[PDB]
Amino acid sequence: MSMAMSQSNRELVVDFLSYKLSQKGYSWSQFSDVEENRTEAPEGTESEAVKQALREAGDEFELRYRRAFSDLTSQLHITPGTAYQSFEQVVNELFRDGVNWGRIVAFFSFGGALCVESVDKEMQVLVSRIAAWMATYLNDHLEPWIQENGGWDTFVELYGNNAAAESRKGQERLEHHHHHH
Ligand SMILES: O=C(NS(=O)(=O)c1ccc(NCCSc2ccccc2)c([N+](=O)[O-])c1)c1ccc(-c2ccc(F)cc2)cc1
Protein backbone atom coordinates (compact mmCIF):
# COMPACT_ATOMS: atom_id res chain seq x y z
CA MET A 1 0.00 0.00 0.00
CA SER A 2 1.14 3.63 0.35
CA MET A 3 0.68 4.08 4.16
CA ALA A 4 1.57 7.79 3.87
CA MET A 5 1.95 9.96 6.98
CA SER A 6 3.79 6.99 8.52
CA GLN A 7 6.72 9.12 9.74
CA SER A 8 6.75 12.38 7.73
CA ASN A 9 5.99 14.54 10.79
CA ARG A 10 8.75 14.04 13.39
CA GLU A 11 11.41 14.54 10.70
CA LEU A 12 9.25 17.15 8.91
CA VAL A 13 10.12 19.97 11.33
CA VAL A 14 13.76 18.81 11.48
CA ASP A 15 14.06 18.73 7.68
CA PHE A 16 12.85 22.34 7.31
CA LEU A 17 14.66 23.31 10.53
CA SER A 18 18.09 22.25 9.21
CA TYR A 19 17.23 24.03 5.94
CA LYS A 20 17.08 27.28 7.95
CA LEU A 21 19.87 26.35 10.40
CA SER A 22 22.47 25.50 7.72
CA GLN A 23 21.81 29.03 6.40
CA LYS A 24 23.17 30.44 9.68
CA GLY A 25 25.87 27.77 10.16
CA TYR A 26 24.41 25.94 13.18
CA SER A 27 23.73 22.54 11.54
CA TRP A 28 21.62 20.06 13.55
CA SER A 29 23.50 16.78 14.19
CA GLN A 30 25.66 18.81 16.61
CA PHE A 31 22.59 20.30 18.38
CA SER A 32 21.97 17.50 20.92
CA ASP A 33 25.07 15.48 19.96
CA VAL A 34 23.91 11.78 19.61
CA GLU A 35 25.83 9.11 17.69
CA GLU A 36 26.16 9.71 13.93
CA ASN A 37 25.66 6.63 11.73
CA ARG A 38 26.75 8.04 8.34
CA THR A 39 24.10 8.24 5.60
CA GLU A 40 26.49 8.41 2.62
CA ALA A 41 24.21 7.43 -0.29
CA PRO A 42 21.22 5.56 1.13
CA GLU A 43 18.88 7.15 -1.46
CA GLY A 44 15.71 5.42 -0.18
CA THR A 45 13.30 7.75 -2.02
CA GLU A 46 13.94 11.44 -1.07
CA SER A 47 10.91 12.27 -3.25
CA GLU A 48 9.05 14.53 -0.80
CA ALA A 49 7.22 17.60 -2.16
CA VAL A 50 5.90 19.12 1.09
CA LYS A 51 9.43 20.25 2.01
CA GLN A 52 9.42 22.15 -1.30
CA ALA A 53 6.20 24.12 -0.72
CA LEU A 54 7.03 24.68 2.97
CA ARG A 55 10.38 26.03 1.71
CA GLU A 56 9.05 28.75 -0.63
CA ALA A 57 6.21 29.35 1.86
CA GLY A 58 8.74 30.47 4.50
CA ASP A 59 9.82 33.08 1.92
CA GLU A 60 6.56 33.94 0.12
CA PHE A 61 4.62 33.97 3.42
CA GLU A 62 7.38 36.27 4.72
CA LEU A 63 6.56 39.02 2.19
CA ARG A 64 2.82 39.67 1.80
CA TYR A 65 2.43 39.39 5.59
CA ARG A 66 4.87 42.06 6.86
CA ARG A 67 3.31 41.39 10.28
CA ALA A 68 2.01 37.84 10.81
CA PHE A 69 2.94 36.53 14.28
CA SER A 70 5.03 39.51 15.44
CA ASP A 71 3.05 39.27 18.70
CA LEU A 72 2.98 35.45 18.86
CA THR A 73 6.80 35.18 18.84
CA SER A 74 7.00 38.02 21.39
CA GLN A 75 4.62 35.88 23.49
CA LEU A 76 7.03 32.91 23.38
CA HIS A 77 10.02 34.22 25.37
CA ILE A 78 12.45 31.29 25.69
CA THR A 79 13.37 30.52 29.32
CA PRO A 80 13.67 27.79 31.94
CA GLY A 81 9.93 27.81 32.75
CA THR A 82 7.30 27.46 29.99
CA ALA A 83 7.75 25.46 26.77
CA TYR A 84 4.83 23.43 25.39
CA GLN A 85 2.16 25.26 27.43
CA SER A 86 2.74 28.78 26.07
CA PHE A 87 3.85 27.27 22.74
CA GLU A 88 0.59 25.32 22.31
CA GLN A 89 -1.49 28.17 23.77
CA VAL A 90 -0.26 30.68 21.16
CA VAL A 91 0.00 27.93 18.53
CA ASN A 92 -3.61 26.80 19.01
CA GLU A 93 -4.54 30.47 18.52
CA LEU A 94 -3.27 30.04 14.94
CA PHE A 95 -5.19 26.80 14.32
CA ARG A 96 -8.50 28.26 15.54
CA ASP A 97 -10.10 30.11 12.61
CA GLY A 98 -9.89 26.79 10.74
CA VAL A 99 -7.02 24.44 9.81
CA ASN A 100 -5.95 25.54 6.32
CA TRP A 101 -2.94 25.01 4.03
CA GLY A 102 -1.54 28.49 4.76
CA ARG A 103 -2.15 27.97 8.49
CA ILE A 104 0.01 24.84 8.19
CA VAL A 105 2.72 26.95 6.51
CA ALA A 106 2.57 29.61 9.23
CA PHE A 107 2.78 27.08 12.08
CA PHE A 108 5.72 25.40 10.30
CA SER A 109 7.88 28.51 9.75
CA PHE A 110 6.77 29.75 13.19
CA GLY A 111 8.27 26.68 14.90
CA GLY A 112 11.53 26.70 12.90
CA ALA A 113 11.70 30.44 13.68
CA LEU A 114 11.67 29.69 17.43
CA CYS A 115 14.49 27.15 17.00
CA VAL A 116 16.63 29.19 14.58
CA GLU A 117 16.43 32.01 17.16
CA SER A 118 16.99 29.95 20.32
CA VAL A 119 19.94 28.31 18.54
CA ASP A 120 21.12 31.62 17.02
CA LYS A 121 22.07 32.77 20.54
CA GLU A 122 23.50 29.68 22.28
CA MET A 123 20.69 27.25 23.15
CA GLN A 124 20.89 24.18 20.88
CA VAL A 125 19.41 21.88 23.55
CA LEU A 126 15.73 22.91 23.36
CA VAL A 127 15.60 22.35 19.57
CA SER A 128 14.26 18.79 19.85
CA ARG A 129 11.70 20.00 22.42
CA ILE A 130 10.20 22.68 20.13
CA ALA A 131 10.50 20.48 17.02
CA ALA A 132 8.78 17.73 19.04
CA TRP A 133 5.77 19.90 19.95
CA MET A 134 5.26 20.67 16.24
CA ALA A 135 5.88 17.01 15.34
CA THR A 136 3.05 15.81 17.61
CA TYR A 137 0.71 18.60 16.47
CA LEU A 138 1.08 17.15 12.95
CA ASN A 139 1.23 13.51 14.11
CA ASP A 140 -2.44 13.44 15.17
CA HIS A 141 -3.36 17.12 15.73
CA LEU A 142 -3.69 18.12 12.05
CA GLU A 143 -3.08 15.06 9.81
CA PRO A 144 -6.79 14.13 10.03
CA TRP A 145 -7.41 17.48 8.29
CA ILE A 146 -4.46 17.30 5.87
CA GLN A 147 -6.15 14.29 4.23
CA GLU A 148 -9.75 15.51 4.67
CA ASN A 149 -8.80 18.41 2.38
CA GLY A 150 -6.90 16.21 -0.10
CA GLY A 151 -3.52 15.34 1.46
CA TRP A 152 0.00 16.82 1.21
CA ASP A 153 -0.04 15.92 -2.51
CA THR A 154 -2.82 18.52 -2.80
CA PHE A 155 -0.98 21.03 -0.60
CA VAL A 156 1.64 21.09 -3.38
CA GLU A 157 -0.23 20.19 -6.60
CA LEU A 158 -2.77 22.85 -5.55
CA TYR A 159 -0.33 25.71 -4.81
CA GLY A 160 3.22 24.26 -4.95
CA ASN A 161 3.60 24.37 -8.75
CA ASN A 162 5.68 21.51 -10.21
CA ALA A 163 6.28 22.30 -13.90
CA ALA A 164 2.71 21.01 -14.43
CA ALA A 165 1.33 24.29 -15.85
CA GLU A 166 3.17 23.59 -19.13
CA SER A 167 2.14 27.12 -20.16
CA ARG A 168 5.35 29.12 -19.55
CA LYS A 169 3.87 32.48 -20.63
CA GLY A 170 0.38 32.71 -19.03
CA GLN A 171 0.51 36.54 -18.83
CA GLU A 172 -1.18 37.67 -22.10
CA ARG A 173 -2.69 40.97 -20.86
CA LEU A 174 -3.92 39.40 -17.58
CA GLU A 175 -4.39 35.63 -18.20
CA HIS A 176 -8.11 36.48 -18.39
CA HIS A 177 -10.70 38.05 -20.71
CA HIS A 178 -11.97 40.93 -18.52
CA HIS A 179 -15.17 38.94 -17.86
CA HIS A 180 -16.03 41.68 -15.34
CA HIS A 181 -18.40 43.80 -17.47
O1 LIG B 1 -3.81 32.72 3.71
C1 LIG B 1 -3.68 31.94 4.64
N1 LIG B 1 -3.93 30.64 4.42
S1 LIG B 1 -4.44 30.10 2.81
O2 LIG B 1 -5.52 30.93 2.34
O3 LIG B 1 -4.88 28.74 2.88
C2 LIG B 1 -3.15 30.23 1.67
C3 LIG B 1 -3.21 31.15 0.63
C4 LIG B 1 -2.16 31.24 -0.29
C5 LIG B 1 -1.04 30.43 -0.17
N2 LIG B 1 -0.03 30.57 -1.12
C6 LIG B 1 -0.01 31.50 -2.24
C7 LIG B 1 0.34 32.92 -1.77
S2 LIG B 1 1.70 32.90 -0.56
C8 LIG B 1 1.39 32.50 1.09
C9 LIG B 1 1.79 31.26 1.58
C10 LIG B 1 1.54 30.93 2.91
C11 LIG B 1 0.90 31.84 3.74
C12 LIG B 1 0.51 33.08 3.25
C13 LIG B 1 0.75 33.41 1.92
C14 LIG B 1 -0.98 29.51 0.87
N3 LIG B 1 0.10 28.68 1.04
O4 LIG B 1 1.06 28.67 0.31
O5 LIG B 1 0.13 27.88 1.97
C15 LIG B 1 -2.03 29.41 1.79
C16 LIG B 1 -3.26 32.45 5.93
C17 LIG B 1 -3.23 33.83 6.13
C18 LIG B 1 -2.82 34.35 7.36
C19 LIG B 1 -2.45 33.51 8.40
C20 LIG B 1 -2.04 34.08 9.67
C21 LIG B 1 -2.73 33.78 10.83
C22 LIG B 1 -2.33 34.33 12.05
C23 LIG B 1 -1.24 35.18 12.10
F1 LIG B 1 -0.86 35.71 13.26
C24 LIG B 1 -0.54 35.49 10.94
C25 LIG B 1 -0.95 34.93 9.73
C26 LIG B 1 -2.49 32.13 8.20
C27 LIG B 1 -2.89 31.60 6.97
From Swiss-Prot:
Proteolytically cleaved by caspases during apoptosis. The cleaved protein, lacking the BH4 motif, has pro-apoptotic activity. A motif (BH2) lies at residues 144-159. One of its GO terms (cellular component) is mitochondrion. SUPFAM superfamilies: Bcl-2 inhibitors of programmed cell death (SSF56854). The keyword Glycoprotein does not apply. The keyword Thylakoid does not apply. GO terms for molecular function: BH3 domain binding; channel activity; identical protein binding; protein kinase binding. Pfam families: Bcl-2, BH4. Bcl-X(S) is expressed at high levels in cells that undergo a high rate of turnover, such as developing lymphocytes. In contrast, Bcl-X(L) is found in tissues containing long-lived postmitotic cells, such as adult brain. A motif (BH1) lies at residues 93-112. A motif (BH4) lies at residues 8-28. Keywords: Apoptosis, Cytoplasm, Cytoplasmic vesicle, Cytoskeleton, Endocytosis, Membrane, Mitochondrion, Mitochondrion inner membrane, Mitochondrion outer membrane, Nucleus, Phosphoprotein, Synapse, Transmembrane, Transmembrane helix, Ubl conjugation. GO terms for biological process: apoptotic mitochondrial changes; apoptotic process in bone marrow cell; cellular response to alkaloid; cellular response to amino acid stimulus; cellular response to gamma radiation; defense response to virus; dendritic cell apoptotic process; dendritic cell proliferation. A motif (BH3) lies at residues 50-64. The BH4 motif is required for anti-apoptotic activity. The BH1 and BH2 motifs are required for both heterodimerization with other Bcl-2 family members and for repression of cell death. The loop between motifs BH4 and BH3 is required for the interaction with NLRP1. PANTHER family: BCL-2 RELATED, BCL-2-LIKE PROTEIN 1. Belongs to the Bcl-2 family. Potent inhibitor of cell death. Inhibits activation of caspases. Appears to regulate cell death by blocking the voltage-dependent anion channel (VDAC) by binding to it and preventing the release of the caspase activator, CYC1, from the mitochondrial membrane. Also acts as a regulator of G2 checkpoint and progression to cytokinesis during mitosis. Isoform Bcl-X(L) also regulates presynaptic plasticity, including neurotransmitter release and recovery, number of axonal mitochondria as well as size and number of synaptic vesicle clusters. During synaptic stimulation, increases ATP availability from mitochondria through regulation of mitochondrial membrane ATP synthase F(1)F(0) activity and regulates endocytic vesicle retrieval in hippocampal neurons through association with DMN1L and stimulation of its GTPase activity in synaptic vesicles. Homodimer. Interacts with BCL2L11. Interacts with BAD. Interacts with PGAM5. Interacts with HEBP2. Interacts with p53/TP53 and BBC3; interaction with BBC3 disrupts the interaction with p53/TP53. Interacts with ATP5F1A and ATP5F1B; the interactions mediate the association of isoform Bcl-X(L) with the mitochondrial membrane ATP synthase F(1)F(0) ATP synthase. Interacts with VDAC1. Interacts with BCL2L11 (via BH3). Interacts with RNF183. Interacts with GIMAP3/IAN4 and GIMAP5/IAN5. This is Bcl-2-like protein 1.
